[PDB]
Write a protein that binds this ligand. Structure first.
Ligand code: CL
Ligand code: ZN
Lengths: 662, 4
């Protein structure tokens, strides 16, 4: 039933390394059986029930079973389970390629479109056919078999390379060693740190270590070495992968009839073509140039003063290892924001509480934590999501907030169960997992403001994953265009820059006292600080991502150095290879990194024109946003759903206004 | 797959 919880979360995290391996094989046998059954049907015998519905039903059964196998590589504390989960993921990816490239299926899906009365079948059923046929042409099923078999070889290679690329970065354990004097101006961070022989400390290259050093450490030489180590992670092994991966992407795109990989991938996005991306990025890059110059000039003066005051040598430039440091000093001077003070007001429990209350109230939902929930780690917690008005049970979400050995290093959201229809006719309960890495509680976990913003960001995907209700699994949850998928996440970040919202999220960890109104005004005002260089940095990464996928006789590190010089104005350091660490290139954002900035235009347009106009906690606007932007999922195009919400096509006005500008 |  759609109003209950019992037995709707099919997932289990008990699985041994042997259980995964055998379930992988069992799942392939079960799933292939359906594809064989549809393939054996004669061309005349094909109908909605025996072809379209058969494939749609096995997609639900497959994707659910698959997450029990492919998800434990990111969260299981057992290393042998992670290896089996990874190997299952490689195998099932090779299985996906085989099933996607079935010529007999494609032949029967095409025939079902021409003959069937498309008006008498639902809009989302027409969409399933339109996309299945489109994917068939994108897999080259119209081409000759010898060309298909070549495309198949390269796609199985490309899959393993992509998985290897990001696993190398996850498995990395590189560390440098420094003394107390060398880690100067870092807070008593130093105590939560491992000692070696010679009274020296171990610094990992993980985000909780790297960024505090680059932001706070006042010895230039240790920032320099940390930055060198960070931008050479997996340099040899991941340069080798990129040198294979990018030409293969080009060669496959050429065989499918596209000039480049970027053209191939842009067709499935709301931006449509690479010409619109290039114009979007170049136009925005031009508007930020004056801010970038102004901010580069203040940082450089500030460096000359600090080099004078401390008596260091002054090289007359901003190095990559100076940028985050003097951007932090810029915030402290111009907005009086000490991040290590301010985090005392954001204990993890008060932020979690505030976050969950905000979006219960806004989206008209009710959350309840489940006691003695079945989880993959003791510290992970489960919640059930209800509609409040009807009491309909929409979904569940796991929260996995604290770091450990073997866990995924960065912030992410995973769809575990789709919110789709079953053969039964009932709604499947949506399930999601929020995976982030904040410190853990003898002092409680204190979140920096960007950690709260990351928390809010990722919970936008959780809400998108759960509120989405579609007929078919492939359109469910967050399965939207990649340059649209960051709309729901980036819009919720706006609630972390509002004064009243921030007061609800904050409380001092000892006193219980609120953040002073003065400092609360300055925090909201500091949204604009360093915005030129932060946005120019994102433009560089977007431009590089495009450039690497538009011609593959460029050196990737050179191309990165080029845009760092021309756009950002801060040079990449000789010997580094930032692209070799650029895990978005292998994690389904290939030729699609512009998507962040592209969707931010839409998120800001929605926030200013509708939420900020009629009050940001208004349940009627929040229900509209839920119904028109979250609920449809991938069952509608991104720009149609924007049109339904905004009552018009979007524009940059609000987004431009968010940065300053005009 | 995954959403960061
Ligand atoms: Cl052949
Ligand atoms: Zn995201």
């Amino acid at each position: 039933s759609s109003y209950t919880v019992a037995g709707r979360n099919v997932l289990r995290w008990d699985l041994s390394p042997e259980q995964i391996k055998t379930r992988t094989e069992e799942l392939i046998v079960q799933t292939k059986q359906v594809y064989d059954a549809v393939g054996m049907l004669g061309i005349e015998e094909v109908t909605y029930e025996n072809c379209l519905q058969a494939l749609a039903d096995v997609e639900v059964k497959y994707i659910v079973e698959r997450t029990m196998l492919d998800f434990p590589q990111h969260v299981s504390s057992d290393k042998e389970v992670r290896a089996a989960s990874t190997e299952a993921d490689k195998r099932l990816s090779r299985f996906d390629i085989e099933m996607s490239m079935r010529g007999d299926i494609f032949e029967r899906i095409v025939h079902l479109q021409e003959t069937c009365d498309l008006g008498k079948i639902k809009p989302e059923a027409r969409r399933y056919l339109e996309k299945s046929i489109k994917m068939g042409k994108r897999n080259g099923l119209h081409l000759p078999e010898q060309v298909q078999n070549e495309i198949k070889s390269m796609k199985k290679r490309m899959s393993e390379l992509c998985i290897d690329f990001n696993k190398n970065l996850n498995e990395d354990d590189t560390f440098l060693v420094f003394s107390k004097a060398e880690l100067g101006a870092l807070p008593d961070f130093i105590d939560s740190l491992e000692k070696t022989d010679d009274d020296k400390y171990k610094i990992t290259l993980k985000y909780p270590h790297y960024f505090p050093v680059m932001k706070k450490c006042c010895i230039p030489e240790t920032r320099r070495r940390m930055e060198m180590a960070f931008n050479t992670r997996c340099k040899e092994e991941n340069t080798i992968i990129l040198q294979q991966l990018l030409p293969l992407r080009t060669k496959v795109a050429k065989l499918l009839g596209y000039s480049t990989h970027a053209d191939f991938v842009l067709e499935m996005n709301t931006a449509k073509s690479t010409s619109r991306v290039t114009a979007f990025l170049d136009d925005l890059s031009q508007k930020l140039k004056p801010l970038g110059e102004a901010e580069r000039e203040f940082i450089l003066n500030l460096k000359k003063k600090e080099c004078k005051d401390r008596g260091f040598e002054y090289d007359g430039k901003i190095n990559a290892w100076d940028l985050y440091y003097y951007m932090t000093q810029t915030e402290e001077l111009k907005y009086s924001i000490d991040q290590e003070f301010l985090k005392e007001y954001f204990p993890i429990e008060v932020v979690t509480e505030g976050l969950l209350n905000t979006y219960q109230e806004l989206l008209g939902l009710s959350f309840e934590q489940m006691t003695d929930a079945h989880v993959w780690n003791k510290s992970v917690t489960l919640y059930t999501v209800k509609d409040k008005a009807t009491g309909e049970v929409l979904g569940q979400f796991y929260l996995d907030l604290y770091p450990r050995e073997g866990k995924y290093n960065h912030a992410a959201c995973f769809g575990l169960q789709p919110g789709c229809l079953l053969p039964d006719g009932s709604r499947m309960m949506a399930v999601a997992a929020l995976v982030v890495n904040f410190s853990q509680p003898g002092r409680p976990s204190l979140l920096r403001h960007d950690e709260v913003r990351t928390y809010f960001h990722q919970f936008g995907h959780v809400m998108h994953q759960i509120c989405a209700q579609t007929d078919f699994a492939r359109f469910s949850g967050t399965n939207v265009e990649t340059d649209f998928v960051e709309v729901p996440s980036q819009m919720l970040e706006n609630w972390v820059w509002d004064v009243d919202s921030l007061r609800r999220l904050s409380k001092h960890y000892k006193d219980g006292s609120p953040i002073a109104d003065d400092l609360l005004e300055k925090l909201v005002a500091s949204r604009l600080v360093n915005t030129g260089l932060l946005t120019l940095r994102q433009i560089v990464l977007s431009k590089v991502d495009q450039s690497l996928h538009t011609n593959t006789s460029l050196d990737a590190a050179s191309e990165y150095a080029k845009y760092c010089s021309e756009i950002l104005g801060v040079a990449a350091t000789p010997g580094t290879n930032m692209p070799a660490t650029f895990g978005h290139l292998a994690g389904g954002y290939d030729g699609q990194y512009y998507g962040y900035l592209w969707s931010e235009v839409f998120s800001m347009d929605m926030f200013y024109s509708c939420f900020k106009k009629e009050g940001i906690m208004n349940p009627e606007v929040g229900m509209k946003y839920r119904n028109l932007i979250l609920k449809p999922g991938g069952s509608l195009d991104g720009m149609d759903m924007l049109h339904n919400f905004l009552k018009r096509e979007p524009n940059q006005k609000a987004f431009l206004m968010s940065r300053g500008l005009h | 797959p995954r959403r960061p």
